[PDB]
Design a protein around this ligand. Structure first.
Ligand SMILES: O=C(O)[C@H]1O[C@H](O[C@@H]2[C@H](O)[C@@H](O)[C@@H](O[C@@H]3[C@H](O)[C@@H](O)[C@@H](O[C@@H]4[C@H](O)[C@@H](O)[C@@H](O[C@@H]5[C@H](O)[C@@H](O)[C@@H](O)O[C@@H]5C(=O)O)O[C@@H]4C(=O)O)O[C@@H]3C(=O)O)O[C@@H]2C(=O)O)[C@H](O)[C@@H](O)[C@H]1O
Ligand SMILES: [Ca+2]
Ligand SMILES: [Ca+2]
Ligand SMILES: [Ca+2]
Length: 399
């Protein structure tokens, strides 16, 4: 079968659990679409009631920051009449505002502006849907696909630059505050039975090195690449190429969302993370299988310096096998970041700069995560992971 009609293999990660991930493979003739712009994509997807098996082939570049006549939209198109960046900056300057949460006119205007862009860039993917790139140049630019439904396949697409024109200042996000934006390339919001395979995720033509610092903090226009939240479950992400981006993959959005316990069952394999700063993945609660992934970066990079690969968040149950990390000068311990409530990590065959390490032991963590993955394909020797992943990961590698 072609990419449009293929299903997730019955052994291929958590996505294969129970009813598995078949997407729109069973689509009838009238439910197979070819789309080349935002209008056609939105028409094909329809509403949440569009649950018939459907296949959507993406042809070329789809820019999501466009109006109904496909005219490009920018800051001034989305801007609320009351919003002004200069006045926003002046209002919430820590020097005069202090560390209280931004409120009042400019913040309210910024929030409205953000909702204006959200209406264009964010689209929900309905149940029983396969979306695949045709050829080697299928792209979604500025878009944020959200999956709240069951049984969705996304393959062979380059996702670029999920860009938020209205980053929000949070003075208490970290010791010196932070700017936060809203759009991921893909957000799995309670979605189940999902396969994301052979996609590419990057910051397109607007990497973070092109954004200024305000209040000494990066004016961050991006959020996640592939995030999963709110009871998201039974997901396989394989052969994806994540590059040139800050916060990649956050699974479990809050320490307070204890209902995520027993969920966030995600398998990550054969993914490439190049010049990714952090969260690859950052996990709360979930039984996450991380195997045969390749990580490469520099702690001294001027654009996207490496911070950590795996985030051991609250009650996380990461099971890691034969992953390869290439970051000059990095210690075994610093391959991961351990957050409050994170106490356990199973990792075997981890290679750091060509040397076998034990990331869990290096961080004093328990080696027991209380599970062993049964749903997986063949496991590559760590020695072959770098080559296999560079060769095979990302969009334009099949077609
Ligand atoms: O109405 C809507 O549009 C939605 O509403 C609901 O969702 C909220 C929120 O609106 C979403 O944007 C989203 O956000 C998540 C977190 O709430 C948010 O703080 C952030 O989180 C991550 C990370 O989890 C967090 O710990 C922190 O990271 C720190 C630090 O800030 C970093 O600088 C770094 O040092 O790492 C630290 C760390 O790892 O701990 O900030 C992170 C970040 O991305 O900046 O982003 C989260 C995310 O993107 O998922 O979800 C919220 C939620 O409650 O789920 C509603 O859920 C949704 O359905 C919509 O309707
Ligand atoms: Ca943050
Ligand atoms: Ca976020
Ligand atoms: Ca997000």
């Amino acid at each position: 079968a072609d990419l449009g009609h293929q299903t997730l293999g019955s052994n291929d990660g958590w996505g294969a659990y129970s009813t598995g991930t078949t997407g729109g493979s069973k689509a009838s003739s009238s439910n197979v679409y070819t789309v080349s712009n935002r209008n056609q994509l939105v028409s094909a997807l329809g509403k949440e009631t569009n649950t018939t098996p459907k296949i959507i082939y993406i042809k070329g570049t789809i820019d999501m920051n466009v109006d109904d006549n496909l005219k490009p939209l920018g800051l001034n198109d989305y801007k609320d009449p009351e919003y002004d960046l200069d006045k926003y900056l002046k209002a919430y300057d820590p020097s005069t505002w202090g560390k209280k949460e931004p409120s009042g006119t400019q913040e309210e205007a910024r929030a409205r502006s953000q909702k204006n862009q959200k209406a264009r860039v964010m689209v929900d993917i309905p149940a029983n849907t396969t979306i695949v790139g045709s050829g080697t140049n299928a792209k979604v630019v500025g878009g944020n696909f959200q999956i709240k439904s069951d049984n969705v396949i996304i393959r062979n697409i380059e996702f670029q630059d999920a860009y938020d024109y209205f980053p929000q200042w949070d003075p208490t996000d970290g010791s010196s505050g932070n700017w936060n934006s809203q759009y991921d390339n893909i957000t799995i919001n309670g979605g189940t039975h999902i396969w994301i395979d052979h996609c590419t995720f990057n910051d397109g033509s607007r990497p973070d090195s092109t954004s200024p610092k305000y209040y000494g903090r990066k004016y961050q226009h991006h959020d996640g690449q592939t995030d999963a939240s709110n009871g998201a479950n039974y997901i396989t992400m394989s052969y994806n190429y994540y590059h040139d981006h800050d916060k990649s993959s956050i699974f479990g959005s809050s320490d307070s969302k204890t209902s995520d316990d027993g969920k966030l069952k995600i398998t990550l394999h054969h993914n490439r993370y190049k010049n990714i700063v952090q969260a690859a993945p950052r996990v709360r609660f979930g039984q996450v299988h991380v195997y045969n992934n390749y990580y490469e970066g520099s702690t001294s990079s001027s654009s996207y310096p490496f911070s950590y690969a795996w985030g051991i968040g609250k009650s996380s149950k990461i099971y890691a096998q034969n992953n390869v990390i290439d970051v000059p000068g990095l210690s075994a311990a610093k391959t991961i970041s351990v957050f409050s409530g994170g106490t356990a990590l199973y990792d075997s065959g981890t290679l750091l700069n060509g040397t076998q390490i034990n990331a869990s032991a290096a961080n004093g963590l328990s080696s027991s995560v209380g599970w062993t993955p049964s749903l997986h394909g063949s496991i590559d020797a760590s020695a072959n992971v770098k080559s296999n992943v560079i060769n095979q990961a990302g969009a334009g590698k099949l077609n």
